[PDB]
Structure 1
């Protein structure tokens, strides 16, 4: 029941960290949070209703790099307890209907595959039919390499869905957690009306290692971090996780023109 924060090397009490939404109480380090726990924290209590739960990985390419991709999917599903990376849940936020989606970075690096894109499109469609904001928490290593173009196209698909939402005037907030790279930051994570990002979150398109290889120099200090990006204009604002829920509610209360939430 005693965990340690790797950034500061403290001895955080486990339940103390858990009740603080997996944030170090000492150095305020934003550590891993599972999709289901994140969506339970955001949305109101007793109103969660999962969407797109009938979709499961159905590998067709029969990929095999060093382990059978079916074996990879089985192992990840057993480890994390989720069918695929993205989890969509309808619910209420301070008395306001809202559809939320959260990545599960433990599932093959939160990579975006066919099921991820299909679930995201289901979330967008649900938001459209029942007019309400969409909130997406992004934590992904990129596009699922074990599905090739069938994964790459999921970018375009999801983008199109968001375009539809933008045409209807429905707000869409895109929280950028740590990390958000590859085809998730280039398709729908940075395609939100407001690009909120958690502190010190590695956000970009190409990972630091490949940038180092190509440039063969020293990257600027604090490269691709949230604090470095907000000065580059890619991030609208940086919100701490314990204050996220309320902040989001307030924002969507003003974008939708609804009365302010009761604190």
Structure 2
């Protein structure tokens, strides 16, 4: 009857989509964490009805006149129903207000162009002005090369807003999701006050293939997994998705500014 089932990419076990979604897209057979779409992620971590979307309508331009770019974007928009690869806004969890940004790797692999950079900057700046904590879910599998140097500069653009937010004494939780690679990994994803990730998520600057080729050796299986990054001191915690909401709620409570 189609759509009603989902096959696990890792263990190949078939599951009711409904039941899988109720398990926050964790395969109940092998515990593989399947991608969660931006709105479902926001739903999982917020009080019902508390989400206000920011800059929902912003759309990409073609500043380099890169051939076929705006056409590739339109297709991703039709396929995912998103405007661009990030959803931003404010929400509450157990009554505590926070700014949020969730990247969706379905859209142009979650590669960061001007729109993602500007939307992330606007919610971070809003959180600075309103003294709110900020939570970013990274998901990026390459660079937005159609915007060339302008894409690279988004690493710097988002960093200046982030550091100003940090200097105001406010909390940034970086929530790295599968995959987090390249410029995103080497910018906002790696500088949370607290860095959290999910089991087996792949995180790194360069890809497995490029590294194996450069060093002429075979990388271990666990190479660049969240577990590996935790072992190497780069994550505060690896969080099974079933503890995600509770974990975020506790961190927000610890950091809640005596206020109002």
Alignment of 1:28 with 2:40, yes or no, is: no
Q: Is 127-136 or 47-56 further displaced after alignment? A: 47-56
1:219-260, CA deviations, whole angstroms, 9 ceiling, x for partnerless residues? 12310001111100011110111211111110121123569x
Partner of 1:98: 98
Structure 1 CA distance, aligned partners of 2:252 and 2:234? 20
User: Is the Cα–Cα contact under 8 Å of residues 159 and 191 in structure 1 kept in the other structure?
Assistant: no
Partner of 1:41: 44
Partner of 1:181: 181
User: Is the Cα–Cα contact under 8 Å of residues 203 and 226 in structure 1 kept in the other structure?
Assistant: yes
Instruction: Output the aligned Cα RMSD.
Output: 1.3
* CA pair 191-147 structure 1, distance change in 2 beyond 3 A: same
SS at match of 2:153: helix
Partner of 2:134: 134
Q: Tell me, which stretches of 5 or more residues in structure 1 are unaligned?
A: none
Partner of 1:79: 79
Partner of 2:205: 205
- TM-score, normalization: structure 2? 0.95
Partner of 2:233: 233
Structure 1 CA distance, aligned partners of 2:58 and 2:127? 18
Partner of 1:191: 191
Higher fraction of strand: 2
Structure 1 CA distance, aligned partners of 2:174 and 2:90? 16
Partner of 1:114: 114
User: Is the Cα–Cα contact under 8 Å of residues 96 and 252 in structure 2 kept in the other structure?
Assistant: no
Aligned length: 256
- TM-score, normalization: structure 1? 0.94
Q: Tell me, which stretches of 5 or more residues in structure 2 are unaligned?
A: none
Partner of 2:246: 246
User: Is the Cα–Cα contact under 8 Å of residues 171 and 256 in structure 1 kept in the other structure?
Assistant: no
